[PDB]
Design a protein around this ligand. Structure first.
Ligand SMILES: Nc1nc2c(ncn2[C@H]2C[C@H](O)[C@@H](COP(=O)(O)NP(=O)(O)OP(=O)(O)O)O2)c(=O)[nH]1
Ligand SMILES: [Mg+2]
Ligand SMILES: [Mg+2]
Length: 425
DNA sequence: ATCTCACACT
DNA sequence: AGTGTGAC
């Protein structure tokens, strides 16, 4: 009997992160419809973060600020800082570190993005259980927790509903069994309340969280009640939850694979995968995908929370959409600009994190081509922008089809520098 | 598309 | 090594 109740996993994700960062810094933006964009010289900038007040007006990510202004006239905007003609995300990376370090105090975390991390609470839950000494869990220890699927069976407002569901869960809880998966999830949720409380006290940032037995369910849970709430997804809530859950909502199925699952099998919801054998899914999607899908639709997933808090690579990119680079002098200048930010971030990384990058990856796009046109690596022996930028030029310089030694053809529409292969130092 | 980062696969 | 996908 397959179980998938072996771990306690949480996913903490910051609410409207970039917006919150700007709001802490500028109190005038607090509790208002606001958004964060970069490069306003074109269409007021492209929206990448939206406060929940602004979302009420229908303002979304990927929307032009000028178009967003049509939906929400009083929409306030904070713009991503610009350096060397490029976007600078320094303020946000640093705010992220604040959050990651607080979370790191409770357990080993996997930085999943700039504003979220997975937490393996299995050992931490076990520790708390003996301390409890068979003591019941008060609802007071879960003041922002939702239990998905509850209340059920035999008030109207949301908070009243939340409490009623929480009480049904706690009233039915068997605290006698220290190996009860449902009990383990509850204690995990109590810890996450503490973890989320610590984040807000020490940063001012609010976040949501999902607590379940694996990463996928935890991630899904987190989005069930946003913002400033956490959701517990038990093993038992899975069949109902997945019964009307679109396949695309599940992490990693939001793209071509998920579309392929829908098209080939003629289904719409995650629960509908259960009627197929593992071999069947393997036949359509391969040995690896098939096994993963077979277990996942039953709420089972084994991807571990990796002990990794730091980025594996450090990269900078810029597009050049009639603005395309057509001279060697142009190509060299922008490679230098990219190299300058790269050196800046690398040096700080070396001091902070006791490591040194060893490989420099260069990538370019050509006006005719469809993301990357060419990607080449070279050795990274010194944190020097001039050296790195000259190196970037050298390995790509053979692309220049122009006979004349001053022009570049055909024009470049993207430059990209990435530092990889870190070694301890 | 006028805006980093991980990982499978090769 | 280089390409493609997926998410954020
Ligand atoms: N440059 C760029 N930045 C982005 C993009 N998408 C997101 N960001 C940046 C902006 C975001 O602030 C940050 C976190 O991304 P989320 O967690 O997926 N969205 P948020 O936390 O804002 O809202 P909530 O979580 O409540 O839904 O990543 C993008 O396409 N491009
Ligand atoms: Mg977020
Ligand atoms: Mg996120």
């Amino acid at each position: 009997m397959a179980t998938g109740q072996d771990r306690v996993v949480a996913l903490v994700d910051m609410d409207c992160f970039f917006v919150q960062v700007e709001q802490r810094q500028n109190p005038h933006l607090r509790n208002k419809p606001c958004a964060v964009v970069q490069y306003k010289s074109w269409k007021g900038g492209g929206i990448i973060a939206v406060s929940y007040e602004a979302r009420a007006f229908g303002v979304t990510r990927s929307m032009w600020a000028d178009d967003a202004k049509k939906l929400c006239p009083d929409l306030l905007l904070a713009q991503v800082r610009e350096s060397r003609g490029k976007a600078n995300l320094t303020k946000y990376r640093e705010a992220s570190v604040e959050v990651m370090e607080i979370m790191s105090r409770f357990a080993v975390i996997e930085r999943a993005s700039i504003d979220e991390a997975y937490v393996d609470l299995t050992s931490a839950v076990q520790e708390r259980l003996q301390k409890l000494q068979g003591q019941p869990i008060s609802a007071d220890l879960l003041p922002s927790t939702y239990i998905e699927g509850l209340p059920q069976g035999p008030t109207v407002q949301k908070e009243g509903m939340r409490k009623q569901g929480l009480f049904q869960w706690l009233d039915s809880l068997q605290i006698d069994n220290l190996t009860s998966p449902d009990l383990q999830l509850t204690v995990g949720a109590v810890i996450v309340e503490e973890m989320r409380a610590a984040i807000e006290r020490e940063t001012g940032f609010q976040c949501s969280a999902g607590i379940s037995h694996n990463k996928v369910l935890a991630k899904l849970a987190c989005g069930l009640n946003k913002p400033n709430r956490q959701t517990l997804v038990s093993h038992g809530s899975v069949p109902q939850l997945f019964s009307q859950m679109p396949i695309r909502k599940i992490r990693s199925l939001g793209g071509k694979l998920g579309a392929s699952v829908i098209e080939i099998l003629g289904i719409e919801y995650m629960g509908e995968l259960t009627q197929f054998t593992e071999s069947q899914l393997q036949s359509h999607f391969g040995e690896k995908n098939g096994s993963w899908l077979y277990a996942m639709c039953r709420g089972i997933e084994h991807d571990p929370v990796k002990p990794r808090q730091l980025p594996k690579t450090i990269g900078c990119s810029k597009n050049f959409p009639k603005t395309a680079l057509a001279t060697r002098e142009q190509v060299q200048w922008w490679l230098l600009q990219l190299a300058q930010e790269l050196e800046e971030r690398l040096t700080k990384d070396r001091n902070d994190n006791d490591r040194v990058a060893t490989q420099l990856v260069v990538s370019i796009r050509v006006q005719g081509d469809k993301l990357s046109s060419l990607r080449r690596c070279c050795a990274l022996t010194r944190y020097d922008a001039h050296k790195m930028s000259h190196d970037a030029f050298t390995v790509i310089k053979n692309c220049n089809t122009s006979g004349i030694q001053t022009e570049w053809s055909p024009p470049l529409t993207m430059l990209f520098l990435c530092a990889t292969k870190f070694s301890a130092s």
